[PDB]
Structure 1
Amino acid sequence: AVLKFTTEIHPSCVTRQKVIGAGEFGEVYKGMLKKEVPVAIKTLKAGYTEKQRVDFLGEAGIMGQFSHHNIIRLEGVISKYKPMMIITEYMENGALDKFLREKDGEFSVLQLVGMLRGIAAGMKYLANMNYVHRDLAARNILVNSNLVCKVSDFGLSIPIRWTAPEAISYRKFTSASDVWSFGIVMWEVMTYGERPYWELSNHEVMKAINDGFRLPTPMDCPSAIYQLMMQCWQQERARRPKFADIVSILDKLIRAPDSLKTLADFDPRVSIRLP
């Protein structure tokens, strides 16, 4: 019953080619699905525990439930044969963090903001479906050949720098802690994948947040975008925007693109004196 919105795939339709990650109890592969379509394949290999099986099929079950442009698509599952597999689409451009770092300065502000709107729309969908992501970060977002961002969860995780204070302090993970994370993702996108808080240690990051410091504006960043990410980082959880608010604002900014021409002041760490 866990697999109501999933398609069962026969093993003869799947070819694994190269290991591209690790799972809870199995290896993630790049592969092909049957013209042939590229896929990512997470396996659950012999010896898995009862809890691992419940978690693995549960993951497939929730993923099949999601049908949205900005959420990774489940192609299907192999549950009747061993090893069991979860099969998703494969996005040629890979994960957003590495993508932006390899394409520094190559996109327009409107393109970057459009990526954030797509991420926000996927997260609005997840929150409305009563799913808390808990690990929203550019490393967990895939990019397709139309620049469409798809929220995913590669399970490689607490990511302190992305996590709201209440989730760190007392393990309260909600859609509002995912909003804090989204604000960090906005900063990642607008900086082309800079490391949040740079070289500060995890303890230093938490101390800075608790003392009220926040990440400074990225270079070339629209004022409205920095204002929005700053409101995602409010200490009081109830004061943060909901994802519906975020989607609404980003859609309005995109539809009136002159709104993005007003840039927030950048604080220069270096000064160069020239005549």
Structure 2
Amino acid sequence: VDPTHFEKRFLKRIRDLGEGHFGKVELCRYDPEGDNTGEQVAVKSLKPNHIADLKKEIEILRNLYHENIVKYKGICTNGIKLIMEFLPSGSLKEYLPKNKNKINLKQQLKYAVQICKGMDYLGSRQYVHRDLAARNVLVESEHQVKIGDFGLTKAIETDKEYYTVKDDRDSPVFWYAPECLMQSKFYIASDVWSFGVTLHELLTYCDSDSSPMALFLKMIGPTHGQMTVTRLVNTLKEGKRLPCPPNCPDEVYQLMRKCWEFQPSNRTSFQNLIEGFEALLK
């Protein structure tokens, strides 16, 4: 009777797709007929408490409707699993290295526009994402990407400008704006900073040796353990930023630099990025 209800007994694990820290996503076939013709779907579950977190993520995803956000399909049930559409091309981390010859600058900018549109819609629902990275963007096709994970997404209070973070143990610090690193405050403009880092990743086709962590650990030093974040904040205070990726026109690098203004309120917005990209595309 309910198409968003997936019975556990028919949910067959095929393989792993990716891991967060407390959750993983697996490829499954939902095969109620039993002849291996059922649909393939992506299944997020917890690692053996964060049940409430997954439930909150489910309720967020369930109510987002946008062509650049991965489709909620249903739930499999204390314990619960999130069921999403499967995108065979995987994330940008998997896809870009294998399709460099296919994806030129024009196409890269189209991806960037689509990501900005997904993030802008998200911001309009009063959510901050907090995990924007090439690894969380899924490829629907050569012509379309979708933001594909919302494990850290949080609502911002009405008449408040940020969400204050409490659990930060497993933060993606090389994607984080200073206000997040120093004060654990997350503005929509912090997602913008993160978009800047994701855009850099896009422009280097997610080559691991040009990854934001790799390049940042070159600048400051790779062997500071507990002092890494402090040295990262210093670097950003001193105005050091990631360099222009190879083959990236200056005009695109300036858009990127606007995502990286030290003060949140002086950063560009997603609507402005979209305009800047659309102007370079015409």
What TM-score, normalized to structure 1?
A: 0.79
Between stretches 13-22 and 223-232, larger displacement belongs to 13-22
What CA deviation, in whole Å up to 9, does each residue of 1:182-206 have, x standing for no partner?
Answer: 0011111111112125243444433
Given that 2:129 and 2:150 are in contact with CA atoms closer than 8 Å, whether structure 1 keeps it comes out as no
CA–CA distance in structure 2, aligned partners of residues 238 and 26 of structure 1 = 33
Q: Report what 1:3 is aligned to.
A: none
| Pairing 1:247–2:269 present | no
Q: 1:27 to 1:104 in 2, by over 3 A?
A: closer
Q: Report what 1:195 is aligned to.
A: 211
| Pairing 1:142–2:138 present | yes
Q: Report what 1:261 is aligned to.
A: none
CA–CA distance in structure 2, aligned partners of residues 36 and 205 of structure 1 = 48
Q: Report the AA paired with residue 254 of structure 2.
A: Q
CA–CA distance in structure 2, aligned partners of residues 72 and 175 of structure 1 = 20
CA–CA distance in structure 2, aligned partners of residues 23 and 13 of structure 1 = 25
Q: Out of 181, 185, 200, which is 1:172 matched to? A: 185
| Pairing 1:10–2:7 present | yes
Structure 1 residue 105: Cα displacement: 4.9
Q: Report the AA paired with residue 66 of structure 1.
A: L
Q: Report the AA paired with residue 9 of structure 1.
A: F
| Pairing 1:182–2:195 present | yes
Q: Identity of aligned pairs, percent?
A: 34
Query: Match of 1:144, SS?
Result: strand
CA–CA distance in structure 2, aligned partners of residues 84 and 96 of structure 1 = 28
Q: Report the AA paired with residue 241 of structure 2.
A: R
Q: Report the AA paired with residue 245 of structure 1.
A: N
CA–CA distance in structure 1, aligned partners of residues 8 and 147 of structure 2 = 27
Gaps of 5+ in 2: 32-36, 153-169, 223-227
CA–CA distance in structure 2, aligned partners of residues 29 and 226 of structure 1 = 36
Given that 1:78 and 1:86 are in contact with CA atoms closer than 8 Å, whether structure 2 keeps it comes out as yes
Aligned residues: 244
Structure 1 residue 73: Cα displacement: 1.0
Structure 1 residue 29: Cα displacement: 1.9
Gaps of 5+ in 1: 1-5, 257-275
Q: 1:27 to 1:252 in 2, by over 3 A?
A: closer
Query: Match of 2:12, SS?
Result: strand
Q: Report what 2:252 is aligned to.
A: 225
CA–CA distance in structure 2, aligned partners of residues 220 and 174 of structure 1 = 31
Larger Rg: 1
Q: How do 1:264-275 residues align onto structure 2 when only pairs under 5 Å count?
A: none
Q: Report the AA paired with residue 6 of structure 2.
A: I
Q: Report the AA paired with residue 52 of structure 2.
A: V
Q: Report what 2:34 is aligned to.
A: none
Between stretches 200-209 and 130-139, larger displacement belongs to 200-209
Q: 1:119 to 1:110 in 2, by over 3 A?
A: same
Structure 1 residue 165: Cα displacement: 0.4
Q: Report what 1:262 is aligned to.
A: none
Q: Report what 1:268 is aligned to.
A: none
CA–CA distance in structure 2, aligned partners of residues 94 and 60 of structure 1 = 20
CA–CA distance in structure 2, aligned partners of residues 27 and 248 of structure 1 = 36
Q: How do 1:119-158 residues align onto structure 2 when only pairs under 5 Å count?
A: 119-153=115-149, 155=151, 157-158=170-171
